[PDB]
């Protein structure tokens, strides 16, 4: 529910989309009352084309906030904060079992919606300790977590996550567990790693509740793309197409599945078509990192990797044809990967034959041992002098 705001706020942020995108982003805060969260989200971005207000930046986004939106924003943020003050006060005096637990709870849907950290830090923590219906506790801890993600503060988010971790096994509700997987994953992308995020994400696909989450169609497409950056072609490909995922969903996967399918088929020609369509639809609607490099780079090597494994020699003429991308472009894309050490092939362009070093036996490994060794040794020589003195 408040999760719907981050994905929309991603839309002006990413480089596949820009200016129009603010009008849609603006509509959601009036409707939900998420208004405080949106205002907060402008600061978090720190200018990548955002801030649709008549208050400031009227033509800079070429969209603006409405007058009703402004009065409602103020009304909603103040009401929640106002209630919070009195409930915090009244609650202490009476029963600790009942009164405080209820009072914090009453605030809590509203408190996350506004995204106000300060009021939240004290109120949220008190509820959890005292046992009641176990499913209820889990739901509540989730609202505390939503506030911290909005700012992109590392500290606040990590702090929030820990209370949930303790609680989840305690309740044991596997439906509720699945929610904790999504929050961690957003945060995991937030630092950098899609790789961590991917592992969590794959689990969430099984059992799904759309409460405190956006929608099930949005998430499945996210999960298959994030899985892919982490996982190689054999296992992910088999799960999405041959398994349940496309049949049940009733088609929203086609962009990401096409991208995996080409590798399986050994017709690279589809791979290159699939890249543009997946990039805009699936990957880039994200507040937490609309950063193509991890996705794109990992997929480009996976495509080459299988081709290199299957033959000791190839022609250029075959490579160029299969991909369909040009001779120069294929060389250029490769230049990064070989140099980085993702791959290890060469193209003798002028004679149009490609020689491939195989990944088999001690030799490929000897090359490898040395690579880890040089840096290790370098760190060692520094260490020997510093400790000794």
């Amino acid at each position: 529910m408040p999760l719907e705001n981050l994905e929309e706020e991603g839309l002006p942020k990413n480089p596949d989309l820009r200016i129009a995108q603010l009008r849609f982003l603006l509509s959601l805060p009036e409707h939900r009352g998420d208004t405080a969260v949106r205002e907060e989200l402008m600061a978090a971005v720190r200018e990548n084309n955002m801030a649709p207000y008549y208050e400031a930046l009227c033509k800079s986004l070429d969209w603006q906030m409405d007058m009703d939106l402004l009065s409602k924003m103020k009304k909603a943020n103040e009401e929640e904060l106002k209630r919070l003050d009195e409930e915090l006060e009244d609650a202490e005096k009476n029963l600790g079992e009942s009164e405080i637990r209820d009072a914090m709870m009453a605030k809590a849907e509203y408190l996350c919606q506004i995204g106000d950290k300060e009021g939240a830090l004290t109120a949220f923590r008190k509820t959890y300790d005292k046992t009641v219906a176990l499913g209820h506790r889990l739901d509540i801890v989730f609202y505390l977590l939503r506030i911290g993600l909005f700012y992109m503060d590392n500290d606040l988010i990590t702090r929030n996550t820990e209370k949930a971790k303790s609680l989840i096994e305690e309740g044991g509700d596997w439906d509720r567990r699945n929610r904790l997987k999504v929050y961690q994953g957003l945060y995991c992308v937030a630092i950098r790693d899609f790789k961590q995020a991917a592992e969590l994400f794959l689990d969430t696909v099984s059992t799904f509740t759309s409460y405190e989450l956006m929608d099930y169609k949005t998430f499945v497409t996210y999960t298959v793309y994030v899985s892919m950056i982490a996982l190689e072609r054999p296992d992910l490909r088999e799960k999405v197409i041959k398994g349940a995922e496309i049949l049940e969903v009733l088609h929203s996967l086609p962009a990401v599945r096409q991208y995996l399918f080409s590798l399986y088929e050994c017709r690279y020609s589809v791979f290159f078509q699939s890249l543009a369509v997946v990039e805009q639809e699936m990957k880039k609607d994200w507040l937490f990192a609309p950063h193509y490099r991890y996705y794109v780079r990992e997929m480009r090597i996976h495509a080459y990797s299988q081709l290199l494994e299957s033959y000791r020699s190839l022609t250029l003429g075959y490579m160029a044809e299969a991909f369909g991308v040009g001779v120069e472009f294929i060389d250029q894309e490769l230049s990064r990967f070989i140099a980085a050490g993702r791959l290890h092939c060469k193209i003798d362009k002028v004679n149009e034959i490609v020689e491939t070093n195989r990944p088999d036996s001690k030799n490929w490994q000897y090359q490898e041992t040395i690579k880890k060794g040089d840096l290790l040794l370098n760190r060692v020589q520094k260490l020997s002098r510093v400790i000794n003195m």
Partner: peptide
């Protein structure tokens, strides 16, 4: 190295052009 997405965008467009004419 890293921060590839920017150049990547340019790579994708040009590549398509080359991709249509050449492909089998």
């Amino acid at each position: 190295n890293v921060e590839d997405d920017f150049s990547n965008q340019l790579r994708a467009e040009l590549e398509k052009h080359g991709y249509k004419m050449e492909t089998s």
